[PDB]
Design a protein around this nucleic acid. Structure first.
Lengths: 72, 75, 84, 82, 69, 80, 94, 100, 56, 164, 79
RNA sequence: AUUGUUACAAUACACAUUUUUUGGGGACGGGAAGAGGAGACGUCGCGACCCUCGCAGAGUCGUUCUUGACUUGGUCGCUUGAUGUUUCUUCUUCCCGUUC
């Protein structure tokens, strides 16, 4: 019943957790919006390089090709 | 015969168990159940769990996996 | 133009043999044929030249010449080559 | 349309070698061709870079992963170009 | 658009060769234009079973030698 | 090495070109045909390898190369 | 024909690239990453649909040494035209 | 009618006259060649322009360096243009800076 | 007579000749429209729809 | 006439030798019957264009002259020449296939330039000369020039090596 | 609309490029196309710092080109 | 004494899996000797006591002084030949070249 796009839409204005393949860094932040190509836009971004945080980014954007999954 | 387009529909109908495989990491494999239907390979997977298989319980919610990243799926 | 060789060392490899042939025939004239067409070995090789005069000269001079142990039997070809 | 594709199509029933992304060298017959380079083999030998060679009965190859598909010296000039 | 000739390999066991060293194997149930092979068997490699059915993706699917010619 | 100011791929057809792969395996062959993805038909492919110092050599096929793994073509010498 | 492509122009300002667009509009620095362990810093100027950007004040940071001892090299470039495939993540600093 | 403090953050650190001089130096440089000036301004992208500032907020030494660079640019451009042999003194270059 | 889009010019005579020229490309051959010779052409108009050439 | 740059420029570098490599140059109007009496001067005009196969046969070249990199003249043909001595440090690694047939190499000591071949000359053949008729010549060659694989069409065997 | 349009407008500029290998190559663009198919006139090269091993004529595919360095610093894409 | 019609390509659209937008005197070299690099899998070569014995991408026919159609180096040494995967763990002496 619950589609992927729909889920994504729902998740806007809420916490999100994306992880990439090349250089695995868990990006943690509040999701802003998304397009047809599945591009990400985060707020209060924290680049957790395998648990440990590099630094508090703030507002940020993320490409579609790099990311693996999306979760709470 | 069973096609890929109808397969998704079937999966949606059923909500059966699955064991997703990754591209980069061979050991770390996802486990859950598919839900969402779409044109592309990307679909929603409820109750995700990344288990470290042999050549063990990763914390994650309802994983909406990417289309290109998915290596396998059972149903 | 073409000169059909015979009675040579089969033990030598193909490419190497071809190279040797080329080396030999460069003194008389410009050797047109780069590689052998028959691929049977043991003497059978057609040395294609640009000029007929050169070919003739080769025939004259290298009749029974020591090449890899045995004396090469030079002779004019029956039919004309595909390249010529 | 593509010329290479056309050529491939023309060479149906001929000894065509191959080379994958990983480097698994093949050598066998050509079953069929298409717009997307989807090659199928028969009596296909396997002489891979890993070392452990083999002799396969049949094999279907993916066009995306293929580096370069070999072809004989007969179909050079005619009858594909003009 | 142009459908690959998978009708010849239908109803036959095939020893697959996936990307990144993974010798899977299973009988072909269904096929498509995007190369998402709907297979009805799976066994990793020595040998050990892990789920019956398995619908693989089109990208990760290079080599696939048929057992029964 | 001789090489005139060529405009496009159509003008430089039937010429001995060296092709570079993604992994870094140098090639060499006469460019026969053209395509949308740049699948150039090699007249006689002499592949070369270099271990991860010195270049090797080979001579397997007269292949029709794929466009995905190709990096950049370079002209070696004109024919005839 | 026209309305299909023209409607996609406003989609940049709505979706994920909205931030990027904003940055472009009001020239400010942004940390651009890469595939092979690279880290670039630059202020944006132009933009595109598939992230084919062009910026000024290109300060590059990348490693060219072994795992034992790092070496943060630097070089001041400008007016580049980086491809969208290599661009992983961007962010507008305050 | 729009209002802008062109001395974005200089009046507190340096005097008014000095600020004016700096502005003149910048403006002149820009006039001479805009792109070059821009480049000079944005050498280090970490030194960002603020949301209500017209110029980048440098430290004092940094500012001085920038000024020097601008001066150099002005000189060089002039040389390129009028094929003058050499600047005699700093006080001769003042005229060049201010008046043009 | 000139078309409303200003690119097609019909030239004609009473005896049946009706040739349409494209003013946008000099290198383009005129199109000959068939009108039997015995029917005298009095006038040619381009209709408002942009695609009827009416031969009175 | 003398081997100049102009002559080189003129030379037909169109028909490539298809056995190996490309650009089989033939200096002057024709290198075959060019009649270059002096040593091969103005070698820089070629500028390492191309095995190369610079077929400089049927000439009157007194000494073998080279001037190029490690891959510039592998299959050099100097047949029917008056080659007295061919000492040089330019063509070290390149010239493997040396067709020096019908030369004027008199003594075994004349081949001392080719001899001590471990570093002096990476490869060299030489055959069909006055030095071939001398006593124990082949053996001498084997001893000195170990890199000489094919000695006048017949190979330098292990037994032969042992003997020398 | 597209960023490639801008590229197409430029010509005969000595522009460098950070490829997948990592070696620089500053030469003339010549006939730039829709799919980023550049054609080098004369540029440097370092085969797998960067060593000196340049080649004169060349033709590059747009998939390999990860960046295009500046030659004429000017912002004018639309027309 | 050019106009018309038909066919096929280029130009005008182009981020989702078969493709252009994501799976990263002192240094140096070679060869030889002495003391404390080695084994597999293949892939091409130098010798031969071996095999094999000859003129034609090959064969057939229509029509005319040269073209259209239809069919489908092997073995053994190396008596220290070359070369890619894949596992494990240097010093002394002489000879020859390059450099200061």
């Amino acid at each position: 019943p619950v589609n992927p796009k729909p889920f994504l839409k729902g998740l806007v204005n809420h916490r999100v957790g994306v992880k990439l393949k090349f250089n695995s860094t868990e990006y943690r932040g509040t999701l802003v919006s998304t397009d047809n190509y599945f591009n990400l836009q985060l707020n209060e971004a924290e680049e957790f390089v395998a648990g440990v945080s590099h630094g508090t980014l703030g507002e940020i954007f993320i490409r579609c090709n790099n990311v693996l999954y999306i979760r709470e | 015969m069973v096609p890929p387009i109808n397969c998704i529909f079937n999966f949606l109908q059923q909500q059966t168990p699955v064991t997703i495989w990754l591209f980069e990491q061979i050991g770390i494999r996802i486990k859950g159940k598919i839900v969402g239907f779409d044109e592309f390979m990307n679909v929603v997977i409820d109750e995700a769990v990344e288990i470290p298989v042999n050549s063990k319980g990763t914390p994650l919610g309802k994983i909406l996996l990417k289309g290109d990243n998915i290596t396998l799926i059972t149903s | 133009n073409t000169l059909y060789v015979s009675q040579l060392n089969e033990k030598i490899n193909m490419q190497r043999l071809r190279v040797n042939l080329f080396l030999l025939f460069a003194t008389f004239g410009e050797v047109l044929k780069v590689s052998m067409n028959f691929k049977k070995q043991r003497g059978q090789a057609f040395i294609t030249m640009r000029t007929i005069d050169q070919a003739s000269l080769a025939q004259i001079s290298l009749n029974g010449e020591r090449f890899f142990g045995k004396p090469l039997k030079v002779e004019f070809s029956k039919s004309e080559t595909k390249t010529l | 349309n593509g010329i290479p594709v056309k050529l491939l199509n023309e060479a149906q029933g001929h000894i065509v070698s191959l080379e994958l992304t990983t480097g698994a060298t093949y050598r066998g017959k050509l079953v069929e061709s298409e717009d997307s380079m989807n090659v199928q083999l028969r009596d296909v030998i396997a002489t891979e870079p890993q070392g452990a060679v083999t002799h396969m009965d049949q094999i279907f190859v993916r066009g995306s992963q293929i580096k370069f598909i070999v072809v004989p010296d007969l179909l050079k000039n005619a009858p594909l170009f003009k | 658009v142009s459908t690959p000739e998978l009708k010849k390999y239908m109803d036959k066991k095939i020893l697959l060769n996936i990307n990144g060293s993974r010798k899977v194997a299973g009988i072909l149930r269904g096929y498509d234009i995007f190369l998402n092979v709907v297979l009805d068997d799976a066994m990793e490699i020595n040998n050990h079973q892990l789920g019956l059915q398995t619908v693989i993706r089109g990208n990760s699917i290079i080599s696939l030698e048929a057992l029964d010619a | 090495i001789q090489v005139a100011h060529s405009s496009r791929l159509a003008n430089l057809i039937d010429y001995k070109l060296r092709v570079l792969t993604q992994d870094g395996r140098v090639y060499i062959g006469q460019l026969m045909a053209f395509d949308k993805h740049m699948n150039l038909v090699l007249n006689e492919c002499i592949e070369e390898r270099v271990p991860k110092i010195k270049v090797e050599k080979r001579v397997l096929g007269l292949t029709i190369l794929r466009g995905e793994q190709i990096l950049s073509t370079v002209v070696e010498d004109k024919p005839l | 024909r026209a309305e299909l492509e023209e409607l996609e122009e406003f989609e940049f300002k709505h979706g994920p690239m909205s931030l990027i667009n904003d940055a472009m509009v009001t020239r400010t620095p942004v940390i651009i990453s890469l595939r092979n362990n690279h880290k670039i810093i630059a202020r944006v100027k132009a933009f595109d649909r598939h992230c084919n950007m062009v910026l000024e004040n290109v300060k590059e940071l990348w490693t060219e040494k072994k795992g034992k001892n790092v070496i943060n090299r630097e070089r001041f470039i400008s007016k580049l035209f980086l491809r969208g495939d290599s661009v992983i993540v961007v962010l507008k600093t305050p | 009618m729009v209002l802008f403090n062109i001395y974005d953050d200089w009046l507190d650190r340096i005097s008014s006259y000095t600020a004016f001089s700096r502005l003149t130096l910048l403006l002149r440089a820009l006039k001479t060649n805009e792109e070059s000036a821009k480049m000079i301004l944005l050498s280090d992208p970490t030194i960002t322009i603020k949301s209500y500032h017209l110029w980048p907020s440098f430290t004092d030494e940094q500012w001085i360096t920038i000024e020097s660079q601008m001066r150099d640019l002005i000189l060089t451009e002039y040389g390129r243009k009028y094929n003058v042999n050499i600047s005699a003194l700093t006080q001769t270059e003042i005229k060049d800076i201010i008046l043009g | 007579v000139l078309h409303k889009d200003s690119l097609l010019l019909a030239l004609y005579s009473p005896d049946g000749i009706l040739d349409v020229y494209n003013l946008s490309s000099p290198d383009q051959a005129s199109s000959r429209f068939p009108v039997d010779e015995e029917a005298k052409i009095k006038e040619v108009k381009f209709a408002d729809n942009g695609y009827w050439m009416v031969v009175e | 006439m003398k081997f100049t740059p102009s002559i080189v420029i003129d030379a037909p570098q169109y028909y490539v030798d298809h056995f190996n490599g490309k650009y089989n140059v033939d200096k002057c109007v024709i290198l075959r019957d060019l009649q270059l009496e002096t040593d091969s001067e103005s070698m820089p005009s070629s500028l390492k264009h191309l095995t190369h196969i610079l077929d400089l046969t049927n000439n009157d070249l007194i000494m073998i002259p080279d001037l190029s990199r490690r891959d510039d003249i592998h299959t050099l043909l100097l047949g029917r020449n008056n080659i007295v001595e061919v000492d040089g440090r330019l063509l070290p690694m390149n010239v493997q296939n040396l067709t020096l047939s019908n030369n004027s190499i008199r003594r075994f000591e004349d081949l001392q330039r080719l001899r001590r071949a471990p570093r002096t000359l990476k490869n060299l053949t030489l055959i069909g000369n006055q030095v071939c008729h001398l006593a124990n010549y082949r053996e001498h060659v084997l001893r000195l020039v170990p890199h000489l694989e094919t000695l006048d069409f017949q190979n330098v065997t292990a037994e032969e090596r042992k003997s020398a | 609309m597209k960023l490639v349009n801008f590229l197409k407008k430029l010509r005969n500029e000595q522009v460098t490029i950070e490829l997948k290998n990592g070696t620089t190559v500053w030469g003339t663009l010549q006939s730039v196309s829709p799919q980023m198919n550049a054609i080098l006139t004369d540029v440097k090269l370092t085969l797998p710092s960067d060593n000196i091993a340049s080649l004169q004529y060349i033709n590059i595919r747009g998939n390999t080109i990860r960046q295009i360095i500046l030659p004429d610093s000017l912002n004018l894409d639309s027309l």
